[PDB]
Amino acid sequence: XXXXXXXXXXXXXXXXXXXXXXXXXXXXXXXXXXXXXXXXXXXXXXXXXXXXXXXXXXXXXXXXXXXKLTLGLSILFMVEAAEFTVPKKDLDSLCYLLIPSAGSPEALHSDLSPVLRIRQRWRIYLTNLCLRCIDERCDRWLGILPLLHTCMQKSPPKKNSKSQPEDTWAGLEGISFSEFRDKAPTRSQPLQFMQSKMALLRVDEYLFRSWLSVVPLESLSSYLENSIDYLSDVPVRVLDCLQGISYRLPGLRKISNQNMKKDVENVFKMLMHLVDIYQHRIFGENLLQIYLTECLTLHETVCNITANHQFFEIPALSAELICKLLELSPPGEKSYEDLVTSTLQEALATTRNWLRSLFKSRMLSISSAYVRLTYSEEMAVWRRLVEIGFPEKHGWKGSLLGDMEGRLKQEPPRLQISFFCSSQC
Amino acid sequence: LALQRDLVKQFQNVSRVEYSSIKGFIHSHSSDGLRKLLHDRITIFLSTWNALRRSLETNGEIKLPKDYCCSDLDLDAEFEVILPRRQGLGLCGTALVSYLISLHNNMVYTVQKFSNEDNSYSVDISEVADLHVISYEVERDLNPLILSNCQYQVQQGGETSQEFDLEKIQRQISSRFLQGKPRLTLKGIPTLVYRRDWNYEHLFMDIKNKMAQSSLPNLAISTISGQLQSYSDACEALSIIEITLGFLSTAGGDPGMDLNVYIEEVLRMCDQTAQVLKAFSRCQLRHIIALWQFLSAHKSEQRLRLNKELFREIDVQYKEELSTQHQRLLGTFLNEAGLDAFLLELHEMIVLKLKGPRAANSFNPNWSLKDTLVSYMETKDSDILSEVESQFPEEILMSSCISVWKIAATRKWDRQSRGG
Amino acid sequence: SQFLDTTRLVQSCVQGAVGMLRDQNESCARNMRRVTILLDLLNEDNTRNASFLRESKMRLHVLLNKQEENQVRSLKEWVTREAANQDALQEAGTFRHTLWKRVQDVVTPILASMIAHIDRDGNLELLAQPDSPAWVQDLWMFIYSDIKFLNISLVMSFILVQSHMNLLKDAYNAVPFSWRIRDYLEELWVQAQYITDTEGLSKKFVEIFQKTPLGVFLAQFPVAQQQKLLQSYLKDFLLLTMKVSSREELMFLQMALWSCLRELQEASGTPDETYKFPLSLPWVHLAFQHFRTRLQNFSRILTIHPQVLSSLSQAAEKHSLAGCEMTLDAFAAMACAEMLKGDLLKPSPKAWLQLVKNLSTPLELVCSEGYLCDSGSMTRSVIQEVR
């Protein structure tokens, strides 16, 4: 009823501090609109409804003739009582009042700070907005994501899972996106928003990460090819691509269908594409070790989610990626020598363990006077994983071929020869 | 001091601080009020530094290098200057606090020397507050105090003289601002210990202070050297004795009756083997430092006689071979020599004072081995120095200390093996 | 998992972990007592020792996981790395004993690094004293089982186990983790002071503490535990904040701060929403922030002229003192002035003047204008007698 009007006017007058002639006159016009709607009133479902109708008329004039941050913040503080139950469609509008349009610098949100000065109350207002409009529209709440990333701390430079999960990295921390990005494929529409509102990436340091954390895996390589224009300006965000892919994989199970194999194949080919477009300017100001540790972690992860022994393309790509980062790296010194040696050691360790994991209990079995491989794509696995080019002074040539020779020599010489002239070798 | 207590409370680590600047440290806090309080305390720190950063270079007792006291520190400076260490770049905060304590204490001392003649009121620096420090202002405290004591005087003949009564001003300053203050002891100065492992010399000094320590019996040496002829047993015995000397550093016990029966099986030790304890059977607790050096030299000479590399942590700076006439003088020393004490003490000096890199800052490999050996033995004034170490060749250098110990130990093993 | 006897492993690493610990050089070094306590309560004789096992193994689990994330993958395979370490194989004898000593060497400094975090100011005796009350061990095992409340970080070395209270001869604390609760409440104080202006700061600080997980643990106690907890936290708060060079000086400062609490709980007229939590740990911090200058003046009086203590020991029996109003600074003032009254010139004519000059500034501060903010009539009457 009209007992929350005194508290609303008091807190809006508190909001008149650290503003300029915006929220106080809004409080006065709200009081005048309430007094105008006081003619022949009704129960408490009428007062909030008429005040929301006046706020919706103000928002219609705010998005029709002049097309606004303070108006959306004030409507957040008004609708904290959740007045828009049947006016749920107004979620299309309020989010539009909160996308920082023409708000391109981060210094601009440093300038539009003090209307939302204290950084914990409007953070939970904006977060309850994001969790609320995440229903069967859920396309515009990403435009809020600049605002509540100016209501929190700086960006974590440490790598994947050594200090932070999904939430601390992407900067969401209240939103259950891990269930939302694994859905029936009817949610390409967010990237359509990300296709148009891409200029918002100069606002944040989190929006690239959070946007990587919302897109489905079948649509992420498109997100990787639309982001070439932004990553041209700032070429250290390839590391954010690697962390955002090594975050999505271990939450995914074993790769079981051809679509998921093709999706992670496109993602790895686009990571290679983004690597060999630019330079070791990707490796700027000595960021190499995090790239190598990140792609070793990505290799260990993506070797653990393939077991079908015909999906060798995916660890093959994740070892060609560590190949590309080692061949495109700048040599200075001895520390670089130790780094490339160690990185190649643990990559071959992961590769050999994966190979001994999915090649089990014999190599070639006959059973019908028709000797053949029991793993029908086994020689393709060995050709692909040996014929990728690491440097010669390291391993990868003696070790993997020695593994294959040891696997073949477990067969009797009558059958080791009979396969060799059976039109499959 | 609130700043430095908070930082010691937060950063009691070594080589861990991942912050470039002070702005990198203030802005890394999630809560805003803690960030504001931290910024205010660092602002007070930097203003007080920039005030005193030339009296510290001259009048302070913490002699700090001139790279520190030359520039005006602002929030873009290094994070290390607000941490209270005692080595480098964090001597700024320690020197500042020491200089303010010296200012306060010399003022309190002059006040007491004048009139009070003694005072035992002395609070610690880990609990100072606003009412323990000499605190005044100049606008609202000293200028009215001086103006109320500039007395005017007009004679009949006609003039107007000003005059300060200096005793009244001394009394009012010494009464309002300087009396009732403690003498701030330097007891709980906030600091980071900056160090992982301090070496065994101070620990052996602590055991020698808390306890009585004698040499091993000649029967006990035979018992220990008989029971752990295996290598793994000697390694286990040395591990146990190192754990127990870590405990007997911070405490003590009866030098008689070693802590086997009353601690090392009833206080849940529960793990050690039989022949190690049968070596330790004929020992007491006045036989711990001697047992440590016996077991360490024993482990090294068993590494020797089984043909393994036997120092491996001492750098190559002290590991070069003797030449011919050097080892002829060594051999004519070793003919008349107490080998079992000489190589024991020499191995002690090697494994305590020579630990690889940056040891030639104090243990130059161009000295004479005799003089540095008798200096190392006279630091703790041993009776082991009384033997044939005065008959050592005075021209053997410290570059060949390891090979002298190998020649002496190989001669000991050849005697006790070819004889019996 | 039954791949390794972890309880026997921890029991074997106890002595090597406590032997890495150093106090602050005069604190009646507690390594033998830590060994005796930790070997008496790393068993499963009870369900209390079993709780200490489950959470000690959980803290080892999380600290070893946080160590292994920065570990490279070649050092993360500890058995394969240990079969190639020829010197460790050769110093341990067999291969089992090599693997077991490797796990000893990994777990021992981590275990030392957590003993240095849950022992300081003598916290392990509250877990190990006979018939300590159930709220003590429940609060101990609550704060110890909470990862983000009590943050343990990582460091053949020396770990400094730093003492905050600097207590008397075996005067270990009475609340389980007094320093951590004191630091936690100061963090909430600075946060609530930044948020709320200085009119509802008491309400906001009490309600912020009641919404927090330690506050909602302490609210589940019945009242007879909460009163014991509040008294013990007054004692530990004064040991953490001030330094008492007596036990009677501690009891007078405890009476003083308790009467300050009861004065601030009667300053507001009739709220009856925040006095629904009167036995709450933020009230100690509120009382000290509102009466800091008088408490430090009173301890300065007890420090300069200690012979007033016996006189206060009469005056308490004259008054049944420390009610609902802070007066101990005033009665210490009056007793010091009465002692200087009776002693005219008796040690010497000079040493009497020395006692007067030593007690000048606290007595002139006590009977001054900006000293007593708002007290009752009887405190001001004692101040008139002191004047």
Author numbering:
A (entry chain A): 475 to 541, 591 to 855, 863 to 955
B (entry chain A): 4731 to 5150
C (entry chain A): 3472 to 3626, 3636 to 3867
Reproduce the article's own wording on this structure.
The final atomic models of wildtype (wt) RNF213 and the R4753K MMD mutant comprise residues 476–5148, contain >80% of all side chains and were resolved at an average resolution of 3.2 Å and 3.1 Å, respectively, with the best-refined regions reaching 2.8 Å. We concentrated our analysis on the human R4810K founder mutation, the most widespread disease variant present in more than 2.0% of the East Asian population. Cryo-EM analysis of the equivalent R4753K mutation in mouse RNF213 indicated that wt and R4753K proteins have an almost identical structure and can be aligned with a root mean square (rms) deviation of 0.69 Å for 4308 Cα atoms. Arg4753 is located at the end of an α-helix, fastening the ends of an ‘omega’ structure formed by residues 4750–4809. Asp4806, the partner residue on the opposite flank of this motif, undergoes close interactions with Arg4753, as directly seen in the cryo-EM density. The R4753K mutation disrupts this salt bridge, weakening the sealing of the omega motif and leading to small but significant structural adaptations in its immediate environment. Interestingly, mutating the Arg4753 partner residue Asp4806 is also associated with MMD, highlighting the relevance of the identified structural motif. To functionally characterize R4753K, we performed ATPase and ubiquitination assays. These data indicated that the MMD founder mutation, though causing local structural changes, does not significantly alter the enzymatic properties of RNF213 in vitro. Consistent with the minor structural and functional effects, the penetrance of R4753K in MMD is low, as only 1 from 200 carriers develops disease.
RNF213, also known as ‘mysterin’, is the major susceptibility gene for Moyamoya disease (MMD), a cerebrovascular disorder characterized by arterial occlusions and abnormal blood vessel generation. Notably, with a mass of 591 kDa, RNF213 is the largest E3 ubiquitin ligase in the human proteome. It combines RING and AAA (ATPase associated with a variety of cellular activities) domains in a single polypeptide, making it a unique E3 machine in the ubiquitination system. As seen in the high-resolution cryo-EM structure, the 584 kDa RNF213 protein adopts an intricately intertwined fold that is organized into three major modules, namely an N-terminal stalk, a dynein-like core with six AAA units, and a multidomain E3 module.
